[PDB]
Short mmCIF file of C-alpha atoms in Angstrom, two decimals:
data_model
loop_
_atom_site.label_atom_id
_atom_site.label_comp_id
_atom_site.label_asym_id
_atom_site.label_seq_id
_atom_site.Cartn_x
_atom_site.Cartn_y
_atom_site.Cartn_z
CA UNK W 1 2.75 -32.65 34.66
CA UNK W 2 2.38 -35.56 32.58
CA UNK W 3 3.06 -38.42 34.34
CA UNK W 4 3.71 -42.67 33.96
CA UNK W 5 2.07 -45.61 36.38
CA UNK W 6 3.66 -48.23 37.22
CA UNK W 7 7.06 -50.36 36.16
CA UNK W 8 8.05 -54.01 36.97
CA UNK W 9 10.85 -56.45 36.28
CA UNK W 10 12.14 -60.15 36.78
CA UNK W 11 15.36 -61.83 35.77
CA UNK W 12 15.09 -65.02 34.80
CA UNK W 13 17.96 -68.04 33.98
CA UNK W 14 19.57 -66.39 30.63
CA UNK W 15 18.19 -63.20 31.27
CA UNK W 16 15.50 -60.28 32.38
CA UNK W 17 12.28 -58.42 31.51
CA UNK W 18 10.69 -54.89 32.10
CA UNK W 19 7.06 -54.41 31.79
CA UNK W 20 5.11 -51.14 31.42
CA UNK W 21 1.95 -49.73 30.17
CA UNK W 22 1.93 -47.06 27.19
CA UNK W 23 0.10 -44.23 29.10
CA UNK W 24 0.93 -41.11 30.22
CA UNK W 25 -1.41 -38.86 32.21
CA UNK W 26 -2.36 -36.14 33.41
CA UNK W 27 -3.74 -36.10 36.87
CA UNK W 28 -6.83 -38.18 36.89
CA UNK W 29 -7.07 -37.42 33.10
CA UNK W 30 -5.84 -39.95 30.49
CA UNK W 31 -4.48 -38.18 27.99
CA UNK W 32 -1.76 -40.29 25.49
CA UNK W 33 -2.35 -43.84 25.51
CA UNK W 34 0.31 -44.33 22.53
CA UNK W 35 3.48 -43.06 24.45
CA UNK W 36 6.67 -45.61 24.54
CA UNK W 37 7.77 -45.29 28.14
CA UNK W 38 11.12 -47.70 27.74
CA UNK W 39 14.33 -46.44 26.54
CA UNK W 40 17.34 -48.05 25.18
CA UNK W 41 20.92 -46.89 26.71
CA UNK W 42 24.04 -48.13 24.74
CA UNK W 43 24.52 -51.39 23.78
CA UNK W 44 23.09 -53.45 26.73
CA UNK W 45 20.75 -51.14 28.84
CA UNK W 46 17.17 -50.64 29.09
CA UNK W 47 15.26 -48.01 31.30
CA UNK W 48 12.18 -46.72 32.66
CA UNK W 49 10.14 -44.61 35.13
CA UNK W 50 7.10 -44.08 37.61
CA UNK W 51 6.69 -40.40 37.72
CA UNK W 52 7.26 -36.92 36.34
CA UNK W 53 7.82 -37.53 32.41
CA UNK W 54 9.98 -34.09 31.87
CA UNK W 55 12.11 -35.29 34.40
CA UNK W 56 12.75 -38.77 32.59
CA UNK W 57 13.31 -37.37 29.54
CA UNK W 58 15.75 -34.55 30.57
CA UNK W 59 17.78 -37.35 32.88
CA UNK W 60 17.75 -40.18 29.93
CA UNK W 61 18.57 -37.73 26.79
CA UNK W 62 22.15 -36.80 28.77
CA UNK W 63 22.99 -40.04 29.80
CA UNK W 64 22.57 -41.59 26.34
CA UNK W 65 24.46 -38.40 24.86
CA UNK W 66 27.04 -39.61 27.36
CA UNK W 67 27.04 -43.26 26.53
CA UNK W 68 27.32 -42.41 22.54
CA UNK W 69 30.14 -39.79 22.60
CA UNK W 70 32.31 -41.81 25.06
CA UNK W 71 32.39 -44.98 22.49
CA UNK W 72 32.82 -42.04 19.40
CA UNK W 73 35.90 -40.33 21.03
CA UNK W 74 37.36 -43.64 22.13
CA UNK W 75 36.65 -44.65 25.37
CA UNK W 76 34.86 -47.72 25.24
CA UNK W 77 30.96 -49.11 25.82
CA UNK W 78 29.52 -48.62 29.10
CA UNK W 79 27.79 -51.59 30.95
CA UNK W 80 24.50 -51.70 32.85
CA UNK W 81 26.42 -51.28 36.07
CA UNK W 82 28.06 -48.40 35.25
CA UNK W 83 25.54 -46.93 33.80
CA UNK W 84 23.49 -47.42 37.16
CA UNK W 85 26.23 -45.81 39.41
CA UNK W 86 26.16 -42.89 36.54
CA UNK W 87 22.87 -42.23 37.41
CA UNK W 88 22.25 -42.22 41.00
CA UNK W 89 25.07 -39.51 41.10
CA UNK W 90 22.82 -37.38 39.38
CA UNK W 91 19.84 -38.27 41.15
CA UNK W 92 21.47 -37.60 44.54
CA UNK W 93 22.92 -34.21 43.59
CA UNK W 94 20.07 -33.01 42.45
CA UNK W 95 18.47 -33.73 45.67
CA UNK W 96 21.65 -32.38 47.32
CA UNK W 97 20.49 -28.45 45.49
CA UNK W 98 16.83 -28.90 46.20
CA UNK W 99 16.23 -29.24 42.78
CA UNK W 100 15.14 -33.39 43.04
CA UNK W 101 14.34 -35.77 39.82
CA UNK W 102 10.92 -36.40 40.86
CA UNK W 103 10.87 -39.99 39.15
CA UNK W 104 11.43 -43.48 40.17
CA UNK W 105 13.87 -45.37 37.77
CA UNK W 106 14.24 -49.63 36.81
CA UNK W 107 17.33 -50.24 35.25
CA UNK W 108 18.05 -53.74 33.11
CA UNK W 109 20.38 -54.91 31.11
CA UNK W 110 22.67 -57.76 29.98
CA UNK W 111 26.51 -57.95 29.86
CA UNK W 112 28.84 -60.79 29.87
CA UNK W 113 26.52 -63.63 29.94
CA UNK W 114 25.21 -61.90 33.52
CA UNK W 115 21.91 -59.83 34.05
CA UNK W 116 21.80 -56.85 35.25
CA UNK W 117 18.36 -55.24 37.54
CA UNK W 118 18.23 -52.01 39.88
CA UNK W 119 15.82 -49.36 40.96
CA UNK W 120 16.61 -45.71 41.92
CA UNK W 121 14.48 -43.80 43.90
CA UNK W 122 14.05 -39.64 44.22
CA UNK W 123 16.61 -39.47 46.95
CA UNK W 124 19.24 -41.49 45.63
CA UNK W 125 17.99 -44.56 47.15
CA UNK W 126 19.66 -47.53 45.22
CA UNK W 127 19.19 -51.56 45.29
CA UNK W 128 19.94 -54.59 42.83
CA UNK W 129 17.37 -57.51 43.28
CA UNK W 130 15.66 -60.67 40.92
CA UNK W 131 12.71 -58.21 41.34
CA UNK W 132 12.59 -54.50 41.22
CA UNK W 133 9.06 -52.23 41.10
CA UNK W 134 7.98 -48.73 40.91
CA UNK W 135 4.58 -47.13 41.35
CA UNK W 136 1.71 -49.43 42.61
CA UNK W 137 3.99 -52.56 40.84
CA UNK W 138 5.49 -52.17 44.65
CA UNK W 139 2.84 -53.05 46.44
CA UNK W 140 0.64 -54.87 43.79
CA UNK W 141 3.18 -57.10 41.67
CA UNK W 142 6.56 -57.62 44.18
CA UNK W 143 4.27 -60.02 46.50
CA UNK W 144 4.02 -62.04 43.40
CA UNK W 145 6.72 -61.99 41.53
CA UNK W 146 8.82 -62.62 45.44
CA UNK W 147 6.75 -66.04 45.04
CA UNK W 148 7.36 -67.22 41.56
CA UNK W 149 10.83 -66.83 43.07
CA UNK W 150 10.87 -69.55 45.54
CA UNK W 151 10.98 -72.38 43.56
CA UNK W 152 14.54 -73.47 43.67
CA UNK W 153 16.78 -73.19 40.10
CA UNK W 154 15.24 -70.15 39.16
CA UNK W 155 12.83 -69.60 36.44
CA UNK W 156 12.12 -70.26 32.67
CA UNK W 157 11.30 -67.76 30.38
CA UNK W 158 8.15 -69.16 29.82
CA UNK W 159 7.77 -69.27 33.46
CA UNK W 160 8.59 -65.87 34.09
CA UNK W 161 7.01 -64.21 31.30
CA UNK W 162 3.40 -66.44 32.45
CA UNK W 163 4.17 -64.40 36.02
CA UNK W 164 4.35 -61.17 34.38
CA UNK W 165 0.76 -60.97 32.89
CA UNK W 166 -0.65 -62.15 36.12
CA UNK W 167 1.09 -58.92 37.78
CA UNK W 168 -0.01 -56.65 34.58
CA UNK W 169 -4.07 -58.08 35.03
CA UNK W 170 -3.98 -56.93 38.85
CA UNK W 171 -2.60 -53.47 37.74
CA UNK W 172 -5.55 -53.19 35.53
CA UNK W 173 -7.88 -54.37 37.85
CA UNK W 174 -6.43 -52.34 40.41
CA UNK W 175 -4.91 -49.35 39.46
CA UNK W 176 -7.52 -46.39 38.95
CA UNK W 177 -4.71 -44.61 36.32
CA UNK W 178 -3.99 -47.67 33.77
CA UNK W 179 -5.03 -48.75 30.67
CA UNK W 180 -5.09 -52.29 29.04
CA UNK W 181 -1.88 -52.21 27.10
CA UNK W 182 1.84 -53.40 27.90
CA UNK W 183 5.20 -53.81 26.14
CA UNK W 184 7.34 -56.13 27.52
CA UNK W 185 11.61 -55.46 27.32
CA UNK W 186 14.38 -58.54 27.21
CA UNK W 187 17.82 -58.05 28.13
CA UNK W 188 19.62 -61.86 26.94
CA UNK W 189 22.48 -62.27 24.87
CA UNK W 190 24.32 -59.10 25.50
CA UNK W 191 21.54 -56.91 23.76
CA UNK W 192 17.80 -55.79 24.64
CA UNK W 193 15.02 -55.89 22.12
CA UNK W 194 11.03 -54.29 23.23
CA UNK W 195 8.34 -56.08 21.90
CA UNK W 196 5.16 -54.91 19.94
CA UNK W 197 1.94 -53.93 22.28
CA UNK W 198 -0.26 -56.40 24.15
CA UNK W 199 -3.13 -56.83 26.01
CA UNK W 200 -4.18 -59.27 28.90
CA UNK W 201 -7.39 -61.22 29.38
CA UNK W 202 -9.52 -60.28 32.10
CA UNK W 203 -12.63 -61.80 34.54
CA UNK W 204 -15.97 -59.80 34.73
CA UNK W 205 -18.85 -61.97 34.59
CA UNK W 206 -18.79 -63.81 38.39
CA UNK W 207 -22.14 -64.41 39.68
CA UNK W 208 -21.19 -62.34 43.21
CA UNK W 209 -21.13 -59.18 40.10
CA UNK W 210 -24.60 -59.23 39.42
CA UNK W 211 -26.89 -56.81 40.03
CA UNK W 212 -29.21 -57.98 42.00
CA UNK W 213 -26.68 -59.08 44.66
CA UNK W 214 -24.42 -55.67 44.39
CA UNK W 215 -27.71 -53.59 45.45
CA UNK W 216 -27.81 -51.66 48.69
CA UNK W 217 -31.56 -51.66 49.10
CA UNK W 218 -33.52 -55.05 47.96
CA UNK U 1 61.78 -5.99 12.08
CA UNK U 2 60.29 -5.93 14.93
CA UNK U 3 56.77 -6.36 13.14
CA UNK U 4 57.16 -10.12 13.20
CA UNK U 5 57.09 -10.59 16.65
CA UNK U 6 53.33 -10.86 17.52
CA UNK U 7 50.51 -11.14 15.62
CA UNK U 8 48.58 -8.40 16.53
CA UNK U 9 50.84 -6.14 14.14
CA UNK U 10 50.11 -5.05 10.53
CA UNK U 11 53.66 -5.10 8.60
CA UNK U 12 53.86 -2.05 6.06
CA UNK U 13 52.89 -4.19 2.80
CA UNK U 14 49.85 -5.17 5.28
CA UNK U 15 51.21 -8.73 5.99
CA UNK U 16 50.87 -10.37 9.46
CA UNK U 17 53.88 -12.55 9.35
CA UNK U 18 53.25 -14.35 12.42
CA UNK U 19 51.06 -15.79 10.51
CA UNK U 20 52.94 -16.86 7.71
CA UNK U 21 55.53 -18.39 9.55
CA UNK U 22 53.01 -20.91 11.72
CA UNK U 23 51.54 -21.80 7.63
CA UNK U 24 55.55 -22.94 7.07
CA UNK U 25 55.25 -26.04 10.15
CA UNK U 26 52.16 -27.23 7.87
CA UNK U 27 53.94 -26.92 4.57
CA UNK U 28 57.05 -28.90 6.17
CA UNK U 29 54.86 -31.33 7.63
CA UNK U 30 53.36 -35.05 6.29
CA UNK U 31 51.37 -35.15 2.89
CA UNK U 32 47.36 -35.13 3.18
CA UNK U 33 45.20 -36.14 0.34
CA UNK U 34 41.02 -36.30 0.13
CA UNK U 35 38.32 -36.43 -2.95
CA UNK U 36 34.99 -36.25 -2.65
CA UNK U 37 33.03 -39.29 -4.56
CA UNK U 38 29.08 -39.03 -5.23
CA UNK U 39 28.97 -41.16 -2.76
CA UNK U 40 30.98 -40.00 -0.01
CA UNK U 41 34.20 -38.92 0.91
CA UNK U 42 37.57 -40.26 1.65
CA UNK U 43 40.58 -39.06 3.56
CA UNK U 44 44.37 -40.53 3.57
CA UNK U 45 47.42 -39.26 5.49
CA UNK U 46 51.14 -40.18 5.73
CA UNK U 47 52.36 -40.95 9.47
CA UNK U 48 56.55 -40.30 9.67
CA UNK U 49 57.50 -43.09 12.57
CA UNK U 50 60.11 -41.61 14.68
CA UNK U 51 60.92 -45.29 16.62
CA UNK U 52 60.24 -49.06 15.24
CA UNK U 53 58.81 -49.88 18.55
CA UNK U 54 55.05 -48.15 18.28
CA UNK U 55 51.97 -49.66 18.32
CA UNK U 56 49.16 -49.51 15.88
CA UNK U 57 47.14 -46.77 16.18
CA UNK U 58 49.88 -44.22 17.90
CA UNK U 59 50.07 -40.58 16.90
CA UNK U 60 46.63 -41.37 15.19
CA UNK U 61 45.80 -37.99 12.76
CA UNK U 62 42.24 -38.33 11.62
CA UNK U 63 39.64 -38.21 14.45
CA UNK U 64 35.78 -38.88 14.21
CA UNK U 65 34.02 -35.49 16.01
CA UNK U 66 30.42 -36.54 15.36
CA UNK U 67 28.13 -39.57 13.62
CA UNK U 68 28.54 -38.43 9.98
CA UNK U 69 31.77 -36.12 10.29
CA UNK U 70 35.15 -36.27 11.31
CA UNK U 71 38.76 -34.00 10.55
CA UNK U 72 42.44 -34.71 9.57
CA UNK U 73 45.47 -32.95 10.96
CA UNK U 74 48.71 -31.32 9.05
CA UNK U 75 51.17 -29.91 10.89
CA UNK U 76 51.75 -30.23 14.42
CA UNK U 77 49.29 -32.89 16.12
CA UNK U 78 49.05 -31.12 19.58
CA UNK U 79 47.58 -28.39 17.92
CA UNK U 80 45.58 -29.92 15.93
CA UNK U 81 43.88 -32.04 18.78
CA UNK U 82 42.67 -28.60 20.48
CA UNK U 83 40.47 -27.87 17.03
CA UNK U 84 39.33 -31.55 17.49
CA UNK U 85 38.00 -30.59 20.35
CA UNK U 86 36.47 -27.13 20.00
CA UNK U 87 34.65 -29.09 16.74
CA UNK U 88 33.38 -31.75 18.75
CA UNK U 89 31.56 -28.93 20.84
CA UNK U 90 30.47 -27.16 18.41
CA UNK U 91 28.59 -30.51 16.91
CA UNK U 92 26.92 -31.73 20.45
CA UNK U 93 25.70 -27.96 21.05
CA UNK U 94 24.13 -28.55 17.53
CA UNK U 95 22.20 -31.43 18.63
CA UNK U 96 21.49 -30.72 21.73
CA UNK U 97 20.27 -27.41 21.64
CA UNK U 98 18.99 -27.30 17.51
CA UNK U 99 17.98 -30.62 16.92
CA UNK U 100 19.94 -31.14 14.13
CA UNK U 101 23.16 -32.97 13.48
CA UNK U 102 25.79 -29.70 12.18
CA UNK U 103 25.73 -29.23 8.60
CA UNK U 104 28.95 -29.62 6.56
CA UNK U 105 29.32 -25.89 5.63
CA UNK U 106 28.25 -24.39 8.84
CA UNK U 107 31.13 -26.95 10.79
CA UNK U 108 33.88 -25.42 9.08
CA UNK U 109 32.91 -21.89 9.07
CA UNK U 110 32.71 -22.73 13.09
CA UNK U 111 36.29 -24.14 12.96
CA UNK U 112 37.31 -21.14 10.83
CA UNK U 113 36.47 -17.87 13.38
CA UNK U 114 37.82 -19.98 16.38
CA UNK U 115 41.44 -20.25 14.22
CA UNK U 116 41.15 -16.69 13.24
CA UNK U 117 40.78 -15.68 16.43
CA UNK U 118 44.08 -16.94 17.53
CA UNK U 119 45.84 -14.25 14.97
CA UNK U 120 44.65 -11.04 16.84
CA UNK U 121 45.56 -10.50 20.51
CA UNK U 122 49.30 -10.19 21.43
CA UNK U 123 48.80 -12.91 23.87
CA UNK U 124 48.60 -16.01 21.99
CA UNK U 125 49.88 -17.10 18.72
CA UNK U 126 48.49 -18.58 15.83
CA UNK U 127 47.61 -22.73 15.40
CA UNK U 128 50.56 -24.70 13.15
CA UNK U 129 48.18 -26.86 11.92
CA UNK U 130 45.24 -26.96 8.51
CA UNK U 131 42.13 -28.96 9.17
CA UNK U 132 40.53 -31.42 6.78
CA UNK U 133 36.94 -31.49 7.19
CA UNK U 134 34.72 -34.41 5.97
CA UNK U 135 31.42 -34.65 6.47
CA UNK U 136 27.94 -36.14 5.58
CA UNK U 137 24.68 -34.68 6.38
CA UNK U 138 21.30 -32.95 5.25
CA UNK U 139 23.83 -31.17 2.74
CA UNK U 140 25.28 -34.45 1.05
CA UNK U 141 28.75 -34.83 0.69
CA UNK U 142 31.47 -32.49 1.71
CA UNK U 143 35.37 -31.07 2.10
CA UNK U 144 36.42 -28.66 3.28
CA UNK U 145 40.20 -26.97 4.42
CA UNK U 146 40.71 -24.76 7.68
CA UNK U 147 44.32 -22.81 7.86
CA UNK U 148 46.20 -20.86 10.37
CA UNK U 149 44.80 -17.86 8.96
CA UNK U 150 41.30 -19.06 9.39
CA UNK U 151 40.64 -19.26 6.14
CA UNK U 152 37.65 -21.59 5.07
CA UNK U 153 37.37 -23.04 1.74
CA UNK U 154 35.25 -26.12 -0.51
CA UNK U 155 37.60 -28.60 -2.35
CA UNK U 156 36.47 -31.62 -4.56
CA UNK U 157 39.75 -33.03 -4.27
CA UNK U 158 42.95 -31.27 -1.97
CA UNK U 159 46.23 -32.06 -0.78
CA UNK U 160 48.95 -29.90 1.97
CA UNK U 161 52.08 -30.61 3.66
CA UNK U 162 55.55 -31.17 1.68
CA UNK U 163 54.12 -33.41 -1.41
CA UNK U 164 51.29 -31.27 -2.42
CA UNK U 165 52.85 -29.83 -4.96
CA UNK U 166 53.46 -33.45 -7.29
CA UNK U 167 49.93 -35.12 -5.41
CA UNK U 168 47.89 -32.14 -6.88
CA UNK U 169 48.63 -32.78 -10.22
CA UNK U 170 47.77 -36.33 -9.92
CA UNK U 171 44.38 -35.37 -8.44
CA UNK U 172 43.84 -33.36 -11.45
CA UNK U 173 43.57 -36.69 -13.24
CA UNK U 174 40.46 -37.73 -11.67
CA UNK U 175 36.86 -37.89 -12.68
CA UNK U 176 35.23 -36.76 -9.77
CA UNK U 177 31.20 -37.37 -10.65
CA UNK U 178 32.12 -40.94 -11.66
CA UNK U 179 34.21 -42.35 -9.46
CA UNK U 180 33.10 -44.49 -6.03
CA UNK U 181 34.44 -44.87 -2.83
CA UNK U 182 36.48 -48.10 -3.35
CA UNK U 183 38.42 -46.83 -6.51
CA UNK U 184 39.27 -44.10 -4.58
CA UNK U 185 41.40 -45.83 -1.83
CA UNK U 186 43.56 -47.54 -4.18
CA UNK U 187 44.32 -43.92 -6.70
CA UNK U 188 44.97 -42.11 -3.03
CA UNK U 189 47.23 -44.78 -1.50
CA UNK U 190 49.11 -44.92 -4.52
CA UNK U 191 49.67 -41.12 -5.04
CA UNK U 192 50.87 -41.12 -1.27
CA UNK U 193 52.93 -43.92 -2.06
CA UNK U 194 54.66 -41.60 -4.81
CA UNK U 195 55.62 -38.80 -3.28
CA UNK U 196 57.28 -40.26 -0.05
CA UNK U 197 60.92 -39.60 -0.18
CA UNK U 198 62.92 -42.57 0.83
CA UNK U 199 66.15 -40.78 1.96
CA UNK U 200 64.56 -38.14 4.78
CA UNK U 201 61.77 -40.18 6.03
CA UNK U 202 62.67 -44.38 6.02
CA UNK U 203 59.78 -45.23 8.45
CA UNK U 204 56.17 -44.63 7.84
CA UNK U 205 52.33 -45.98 7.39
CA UNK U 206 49.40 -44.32 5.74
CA UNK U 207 45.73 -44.08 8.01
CA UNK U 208 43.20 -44.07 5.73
CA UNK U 209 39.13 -43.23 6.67
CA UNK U 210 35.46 -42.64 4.80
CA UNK U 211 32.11 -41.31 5.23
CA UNK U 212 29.70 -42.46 2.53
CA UNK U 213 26.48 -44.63 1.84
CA UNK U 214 28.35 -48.59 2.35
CA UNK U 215 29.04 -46.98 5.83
CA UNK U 216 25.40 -45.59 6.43
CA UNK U 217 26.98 -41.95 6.29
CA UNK U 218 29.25 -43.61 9.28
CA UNK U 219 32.26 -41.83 9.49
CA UNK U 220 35.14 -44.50 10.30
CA UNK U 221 38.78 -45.64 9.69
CA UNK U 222 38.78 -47.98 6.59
CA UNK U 223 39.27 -51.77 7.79
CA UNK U 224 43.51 -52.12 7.44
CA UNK U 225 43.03 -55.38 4.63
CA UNK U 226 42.04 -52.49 1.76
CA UNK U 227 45.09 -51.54 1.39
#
């Protein structure tokens, strides 16, 4: 039962970006921290998951064997959307046999000069947004990322990519199952590309840390 | 001779000429031609128009069925396209359940039993069509020809249908370790060119495709300015 933390995306003006960590784990134990979670779909279409890591695999290897044989025998290159809609049919049958994708899915990509962002959920739950989450990125990075977005216009990329390490430092800070290490996934110009691994700066040395002020009895 | 009416019967001489008779649509059918470079292969076909008013690309005879390998139909197309299909398949079960994209050899021997077994039940009749297989993977380079039979053989260079007679012995005029991929779409156009007849057949276009190292063992139709 290998399993992935959390997910998080923004689109910004030209574009979007998906953010993970490369971890997978197994309950409280951290077993591979060298595991690429994001996977490229097609021409245009980037995804990953919060959750059961057999079940992402199984789901992405058969829609990507879908995506390549349709353009091979003829029938064109899907887009992000469709790709979407492909998927939450799956997800909901599955439920519908008792048989669920125990996952939670983030879905990017970039057609047609237009940006594409959507989360799944394990029920067939589906939603597009400027910011989509799974895992603890729901209740951890959304606050967040919902205020970057307020500014009218929209963001940069250097804007949104500044917002996106802030959001990756909590998750570190906060997240007992996490490790300091992120790729980050752009979707501009009708294709994606994923990025090399990073890893954030972080704060330990405040005065209210010490030890004389942390101990219970003085 | 009532032994020719199914092919589930033997003939005395130990014939099936059911059989037989579907191998005569392929033999009055368009002229095929392929070669097999060190690089790669290379497949050509002659379409017969039957209207001046078709678009590009209709009655298409040479069909991609994975990455690295696709086929060419002689004789009747409709028949033809259910083989497509079985082959196509038989190459996803390969990769999905194996690991592996199919093997050259192991393709057509799949393509072979599923013809063959179309010449032994009384309730279905042979295919009317042979399959050129061309394909590039852990095996290098490859050709092979399916019949109606289901007969499976390796060619270097091959031709069917009503000119193979005349195109074979201008294949046999060839240097097949030497020559590359680009030579060989101007000597197989031209031996095409040849043997159309002028008076039966006024319309027609040649398709022309490749698998080989320019195309990253890509197998595609070759762009329509080389030609």
């Amino acid at each position: 039962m290998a399993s992935g933390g959390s997910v998080i995306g923004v689109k910004y003006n030209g574009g979007v970006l998906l953010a993970c960590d490369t971890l997978l784990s197994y309950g409280s134990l951290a077993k591979w921290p060298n595991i690429p979670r994001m996977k490229l779909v097609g021409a245009y279409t980037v995804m990953c998951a919060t959750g059961d890591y057999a079940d992402f695999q199984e789901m992405t290897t058969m829609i990507e064997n879908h995506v390549n044989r349709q353009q091979m025998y003829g029938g064109g290159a899907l887009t992000p959307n469709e790709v979407f809609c492909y998927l939450q049919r799956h997800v909901y049958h599955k439920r519908s046999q008792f048989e669920p994708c125990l996952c939670r899915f983030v879905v990017a990509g970039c057609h047609g000069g237009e940006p594409f962002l959507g989360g799944v959920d394990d029920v067939g739950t589906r939603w597009t947004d400027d910011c989509v989450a799974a895992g603890y990125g729901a209740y951890v990075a959304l606050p967040l990322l919902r205020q970057a977005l307020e500014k009218p216009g929209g963001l940069t990329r250097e804007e949104a990519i500044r917002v996106i390490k802030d959001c990756l430092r909590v998750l570190f800070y906060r997240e007992c199952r996490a490790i300091n290490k992120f790729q980050i996934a752009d979707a501009t110009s009708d294709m994606v590309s994923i990025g090399e691994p990073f890893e954030v700066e972080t704060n330990w040395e405040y005065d209210g840390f010490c030890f004389e002020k942390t101990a219970i009895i003085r | 001779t009532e032994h020719d009416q199914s092919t589930d019967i033997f003939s005395a001489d130990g014939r099936v000429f059911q059989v037989e008779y579907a191998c005569k649509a392929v033999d009055n059918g368009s002229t095929a031609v392929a070669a097999c470079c060190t690089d790669g292969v290379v497949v050509a076909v002659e379409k017969i128009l039957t209207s001046r008013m078709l678009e590009e690309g209709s009655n298409d005879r040479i069909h991609a069925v994975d990455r690295q390998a696709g086929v060419c139909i002689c004789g009747m197309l409709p028949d033809g396209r259910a083989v497509v299909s079985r082959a196509r398949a038989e190459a996803e079960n390969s990769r999905d359940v194996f690991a592996t994209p199919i093997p050259g050899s192991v393709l057509a021997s799949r393509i072979g039993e599923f013809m063959h077994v179309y010449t032994t039940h009384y309730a279905y009749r042979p295919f009317g069509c042979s399959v050129i297989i061309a394909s590039y993977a852990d095996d290098g380079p490859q050709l092979f020809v399916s019949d109606p039979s289901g007969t499976v053989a390796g060619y270097y260079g091959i031709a069917l249908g009503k000119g193979k007679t005349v195109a074979k012995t201008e294949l046999e005029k060839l240097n097949f370790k030497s020559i590359t991929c680009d030579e060989a779409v101007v000597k197989l156009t031209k031996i095409l060119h040849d043997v159309h007849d002028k008076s039966k057949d006024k319309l027609y276009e040649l398709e022309v495709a490749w698998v080989c190292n320019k195309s990253n063992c890509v197998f595609q139709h070759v762009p329509n300015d080389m030609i």
